Amino acid sequence: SEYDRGVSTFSPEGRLFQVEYSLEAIKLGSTAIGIATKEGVVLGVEKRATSPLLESDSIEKIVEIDRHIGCAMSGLTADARSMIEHARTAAVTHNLYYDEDINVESLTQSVCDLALRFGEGASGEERLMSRPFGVALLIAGHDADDGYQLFHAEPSGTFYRYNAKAIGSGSEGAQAELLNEWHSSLTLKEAELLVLKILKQVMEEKLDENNAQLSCITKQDGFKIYDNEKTAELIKELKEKEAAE
Template sequence: MERYDRAITIFSPDGHLFQVEYAQEAVKKGSTAIGVRGKDCVVIGVEKKSIPTLQDDRTIRKIHSIDEHVMLAFAGLSADARVLVDYARIECQSYKLTLEDPVTVGTIARYVANMKQRFTQSPGRRPFGISMLIGGFDYDGTPRLFKTEPSGTYYEYFANSTGRGEKPVREYLEEHYSDETTKDEAAVLKLVIKALSQVVQSGAQNIEIAVMTANNERESHCSHRVLSVEEVENLLKEVDDERVAAESEEGKKK
């Protein structure tokens, strides 16, 4: 085996860092995650895999709150995510103590991306096998959504996905994302449910959704909540009823 296939700091003859590409493969095997930025909200949804009967599902979280105004979801290795989540939380608090302002979403996305990038340059380490969707609000009330990769790259998006179902979910978002489907929280929730339904077929128990909205009346200026299973079930039923009605209307036209 050639050294460039084992060492993180050596490029292959055709310009690849194979260990980084292997980390990306770990992401592709992870649960699907989706993030959508609306006009006044950010919604993140994830696919929850089935767990052993005796395992407490409260110990399995794919969506994490980083600060009062920032949350993230990930696909890939959960242990790697736990480390980065802890670092991100510390950075949020350090930023607030130093500058007396809440950290911007772009700043924390860049911080996470920089940490990932450092682990692609140092011998004796390996890249983080996770991709993250980081969403929230800046202190001026602007919703933001970023995606970071194992290589350390990061970009801002209106909507995106990651994980094993990234391609079909992203294609659905590209086709259906519009001002109409993101006009308010209810519309964004439906868009996220419909997109996740492209890869999740087993109901509300396998979907987790978190919503963050701007709230100028509170000191934190943001409110964050995770939807209950009952709320997800109601959304799925509403979306299914709309689909049946649309198919019925289409049948009448024929």
């Protein structure tokens, strides 16, 4: 209301207005959509440019965290620059101490612990972060004690496990569609093309391989960032499919 100027600070509903405010920053961002299947998690994005001079495949919205955790991001790339580096640190230091591929669920909590800091210092954890982060992440990977998992990290330090989740502008239109078309029985090929169907609709640009970028975590292939020749092939396979429908 008017209680939002501090670094806490309630609020007669009992919420932290500051924390909530940062949620709507995520809708500023470019759409990011993930779909877990028991064969892998397919992380697709929208890439927005303000002019065609912006070199589309030079900007980051999908990133490698280690060798088996990947992330897609929507929001500020400023707030994500510190956030991602933490997660990287975390994963590398976990392999140092224990020789173990960090768990998807624990990697998520790790992200979200930095996230909790909103103060200028406070009892419990020591806080240096002077404002919420303004970026959510989709965290996808594979551990072998709980298979392929999909999490949604929020900068509120709430982490929900998910089976399919979308965020950014087209969040609302994506989430409705994903409600009517999830299966446990999806092949990785059905998963991939499902991401593209949903992605065109909640886009308000034109769909090409440079306004898209899919990726997977499958243990065999590791984290694989797709080629644009590869990504085009799927876009072609997209057009063929709606003809039948």
